């Protein structure tokens, strides 16, 4: 389970 994500 992920609950948000911001990736760079």
Do not use: R
Not at 1 to 8: K, P, W, Y
Request: without cysteine.
């Amino acid at each position: 389970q992920i609950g948000l994500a911001q990736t760079q």
